[PDB]
């Protein structure tokens, strides 16, 4: 508890010659800056947001950036795609952040699936789909998720699976046609040989209609976000079933004795990353 | 091209093997009554919102 005070009224109180207290201040400042930038990101400003994010030591704060991106995507799924694009850029320069984001996203999806958390399933699945579209994650992840949802299908499972396929179906078709054809064959078999509600059969029908339309309402990446060339991207292969450590300890501040030295090292790398 | 597709389908088949075998060891997927855990029991679980 306690009343919030504006930061201006805080700068008049104390001032800091740098090491321990500086590290704590800079850690909190980095967290605030990353959170603000993730709140600012959109398609029209993706480039400037990328360069301003790269000006920050995002490898030291890779857990902070991961947590902020996941929170933003979970709370604002309308922008999943651009978030993915953002990742797709940073992952092209610092793959460890992409791997970290991907692993905690997979654990989030699995937790939601186990916990019967609808909205979290939808958000995590959409994020996985658009990270697949940006070549950040290997397409295997999609196919295993769809097989999981359709092995013993329920109404809700078919709904979440069909919503997931809507987003990544074009990429799956270009990359793995036989897998998506198997998915559609299973969809037809469930549409016919199963007792089901009219709504879910209608959803299967609209999925077949969108495939017949060629996913014209669900492109891979919208114009303005294809910013990493296939040959320059680093596509992580993380299966769904593997046991992962989200490394939550990376979100908590710890003092490093060579702090200023590694900070200068990151500044030297930043004067290289353009 | 087709090599990537063979490899992805191989990984998918390994997943399906580990999946269909995980529901066998689970206590009777027709009538299981478990706890509401916080981590995961996911591979056997089914969705009911």
């Amino acid at each position: 508890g306690g009343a919030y005070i504006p930061p201006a009224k805080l700068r008049m109180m104390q001032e800091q010659k740098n090491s321990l207290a500086y590290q704590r201040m800079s850690w909190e400042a980095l967290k605030k800056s990353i959170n603000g930038l993730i709140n600012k990101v959109n398609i029209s400003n993706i480039s400037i947001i990328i360069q301003e994010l790269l000006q920050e030591n995002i490898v030291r704060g890779r857990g902070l950036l991961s947590r902020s991106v996941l929170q933003a995507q979970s709370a604002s799924p309308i922008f999943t795609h651009v978030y993915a694009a953002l990742v797709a850029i940073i992952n092209s320069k610092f793959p460890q952040i992409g791997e970290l984001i991907l692993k905690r996203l997979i654990l989030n999806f699995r937790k939601g699936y186990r916990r019967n958390d609808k909205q979290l399933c939808l958000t995590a699945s959409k994020f996985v789909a658009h990270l697949i579209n940006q070549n950040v994650a290997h397409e295997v992840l999609c196919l295993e998720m769809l097989t999981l949802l359709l092995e013993r299908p329920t109404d809700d499972s078919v709904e979440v699976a069909i919503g997931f396929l809507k987003e990544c179906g074009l990429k799956l078709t270009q990359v793995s046609p036989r897998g998506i054809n198997a998915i559609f064959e299973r969809l037809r078999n469930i549409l016919h040989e199963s007792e089901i509600d009219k709504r879910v059969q209608y959803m299967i029908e609209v999925m077949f209609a969108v495939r017949k339309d060629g996913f014209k309402d669900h492109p891979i990446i919208l114009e303005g976000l294809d910013l990493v060339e296939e040959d320059d991207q680093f596509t992580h292969m993380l299966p769904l079933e593997d046991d992962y450590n989200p490394e939550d300890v990376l979100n908590v501040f710890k003092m490093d004795p060579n702090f200023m030295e590694n900070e200068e090292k990151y500044k030297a790398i930043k004067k290289e990353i353009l | 091209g087709t090599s990537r597709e063979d490899q992805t389908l191989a990984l998918l088949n390994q997943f399906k093997s580990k999946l269909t075998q995980a529901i066998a060891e689970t206590p009777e997927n027709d009538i299981p009554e478990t706890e509401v855990e916080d981590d995961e029991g996911w591979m056997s679980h089914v969705l009911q919102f």
Partner: protein, 162 residues
Amino acid sequence: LTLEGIKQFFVAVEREEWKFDTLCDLYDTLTITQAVIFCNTKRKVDWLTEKMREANFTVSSMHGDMPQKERESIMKEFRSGASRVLISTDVWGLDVPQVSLIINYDLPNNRELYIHRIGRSGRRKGVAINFVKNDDIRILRDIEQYYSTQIDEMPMNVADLI
């Protein structure tokens, strides 16, 4: 129109100098889907949209002097998600369900406009933040009493209370 369910907060920015620095700080501590920023004057709205675009915000601006048809064309852009914040003066409920936040960068001069800014038609439970200065606190406790609602001082803990 009513205020029931809308979490209403205020922060004592105490003077204009700290308003913008507070707004930015909010964006550095909160999780915001989209937001609507309300200012009293149109010159203040122009300055704020220019200063937020300077901060690399995707903003759409709106004021009561534009025709009733171009204002629709601007809110269509804001609803499409092209901009993630909408800064406007008094013109009307609103036409965006995903607005996580409504910020009164300025408190309304006359009281009877407040409900047209933050209130909801037929009460989505949302959050409203009021930028009150030491001169504006009188209008704060005039609006607390008129609508018989309560507005609480925002805590540093507000990030954990959505």
